[PDB]
């Protein structure tokens, strides 16, 4: 392997104490920057939590819950009485006074919960809904739902769906280009049957020509085409595919190839070193989506079953946060080689990147990204005019496109993401968690754990090594 | 009295059968127009009811509620099971498996429920919030809360608050003018102590100079100034004040004087005849807000206590709807004399006015109006570009300004309006009421009642004449 590819391989499952300790100083925000990040994060989070005065109203209730020492079901009774009294029109009057059921249930629960996350049933419908936010400075990436093709027929249908989508998105883009215009994202697992266990030779013979074909088509329309990151044991083959793609003569001088990297992997910073070298060698600017990672629960389960030396992902959420910040700095350092796209719904992460990107933002420096149904509220504070009290930073919304028949896997990942006690979007909804705790700096949090536990980067107490 | 003033007086409490029968043909929409009104009303109402697919989702539930014959608490249990199952990360695993308390309570209930209806605590705060919707084509009228001044000191404080508000609104308007720019609305009951029983001479000596002063100030800034309509026994004195105001030399050639008329009053069409004559004589275009009326519950109570010959308002809601349509046609007929401002949250009423206004709309022909916290959803379909799927008709939002100390009366009127089974905004939320019933034409509804009951315009069966 090349020097950079070899380094990736060696970092695959390196001990967490080692991995985290190495990231810490790369992730640490300079005192000035950290303060500004905190203030901005606090502000974003406060505005989000207090949208319709939710907190102000809460304070009003408790202010009476004590003046009468009433229970929850008590204060409510009083409000009910007060409401009835306020409905008296005249003040004087007021004053004076089998398995199919289970299978169907899961299917329906999936669809009801999934609606919030899906932009459209078809690409035409999705694209029709774009103007509203695009006119506000938002951008879109269309995510054709459906993954892990099991059969040759399945993969072919996905291929056809991508091609049609590119034509549609490309026509809608109308030459807006890879930055301001919409793009598409693809899953390699959709393009090859049984990708999960597919061998190198067959992937190169069969998947690659499909990847190349879609990419050439995207280039014809000048839209971004992003390669999604999936399970960790497919990282290596995805890099091999990316490597080959970047050297296609027909793509020379075109910077629309995108690639996701997952900060929850120990390999992430090493993947970045490789990508930097690849952009240099292939003479392009890569569009890189930095995400934390959507498959954590499965990654942990998988590793515990394979009984290997360790995990390919961190076991404490705060370590993934630290990894993201360290990786963000690396990406921001090389604007000639990478267009960083910072996917996050986390107010601290957003504010940290905003400060790390430095003075003198220009549109092509970077963008934020979010998932439809999750990020719009946060980014409505971010994308738009400074005069309107926004940050004037672009956000690209990932917009799922598909019917109920393709929704399951995506929906499950969203449930895990939204339901996890560790998730920012879960904690922001816990009004008992103080804002300062919510937007706490991850590097400092890691150092606090280190002082308490006796060393930096210990694994989660409840997630022992697979061999234990 | 003049011919027009005399006609108003004679119509004060005319029998409902007579009043309604007289309105019917003036209100009747030409077959073509009625159909277009129905289609548009249905569309507006459907989009409002189905915002986040509320109905589509409802249909999905019942589709299973029968396939298993499950109770409400039953289907819910299944969804709960399905949700837990969908939280299993790996599919294989899933598959295999005293009076102060009362006074305080009323105060707090008032404030919690009132927030949705109040734009700002102060005029500066209110004005700061205007750009968002103004940029979308909305307009504002600021409603300084506080009415029915009891003391001289009270009225003076209201007067000062209005003056300060005009300066603020006028500065914010910045010469946008009476149509495109914000205006203010005032209550005569705020400007004179014990207005409810005030005599003509004292009102002319004391209230009028205040009204004149505010109006001259509004003219200096070229903003609209609207006289609110209050209880029915103050209609006459309000007309006397308006009459005098319209002939002030300093207001000559200025068309910013506004006046509300209430369609629920039997006098409404006669007031319009008077206003038409007044605009002609005083050589101005009057800004007229046609509203249905906010004091119905109190009007009925008042009449039943005074034991008079009849009611000054209709006793069936559908009659008020008919009155509004008849009155709207009268206003639209005289664009040189009146700028009609159609206040309503009712999709049928809106659609009917839209069609009645005819072909070749121009911005200065008319506007719609709504209350903050009630009308924005409906009018988001209306104000804005045709290309964006809107109707391109302006709506002016009435924006209450004030603290909790001035909120009570306004809030109570909003509770009655929102809570009434007869209110459009209440019925649209009743998903068991078919859309077609919701947007049913009021003239046809009245004719249906007439055929069933044996004559047109009978009073509400539950609201006998006061002397009964
Ligand atoms: C536009 C877009 C494209 C995306 N593409 C991909 C993609 O191709 N592949 C993909 O994998 N994800 C992808 N993601 C999504 C992504 O990974 C999740 O949305 C993300 O991890 C949420 O991070 P956050 O900063 O919003 O929330 P945060 O609440 O701050 O962090 C959330 C998360 O931390 C991690 N985590 C949770 N618990 C632990 C733990 N105990 N130990 C270590 N880490 C933990 C997870 O990665 C997790 O999702 C994409 C997201 C967006 C917005
Ligand atoms: C910008 C603005 C300014 C306003 N200014 C004033 C004002 O100065 N004075 C004022 O009085 N109102 C004023 N109103 C408000 C107003 O009168 C109510 O908002 C209104 O009546 C609601 O009508 P609607 O078409 O939205 O609802 P709809 O549901 O179609 O009709 C509602 C109503 O019909 C009436 N009604 C209810 N029951 C009966 C019945 N049994 N018999 C007869 N009629 C019945 C009422 O007038 C009532 O509010 C204003 C409203 C707005 C938007
Ligand atoms: O599948 C997922 O969970 C993420 C989100 C999308 O952008 C696609 N990759
Ligand atoms: O007081 C009311 O109820 C109405 C609404 C405002 O426009 C003022 N008049």
Swiss-Prot record, chains A, B:
Q: Tell me the disulfide pairings in this chain.
A: none
Question: What ranges does the record give for the region Proline dehydrogenase, renumbered to this chain?
Answer: 98-432
Induction comment from the UniProt entry of this chain? By proline, autorepression and catabolite repression, and is potentially nitrogen controlled.
> Function of this protein?
Oxidizes proline to glutamate for use as a carbon and nitrogen source and also function as a transcriptional repressor of the put operon.
**Subunit architecture:** Homodimer.
Q: Which family does it belong to?
A: In the N-terminal section; belongs to the proline dehydrogenase family.
This one is known as Bifunctional protein PutA
What fragment of the full-length protein is this? 88 to 610 of 1320
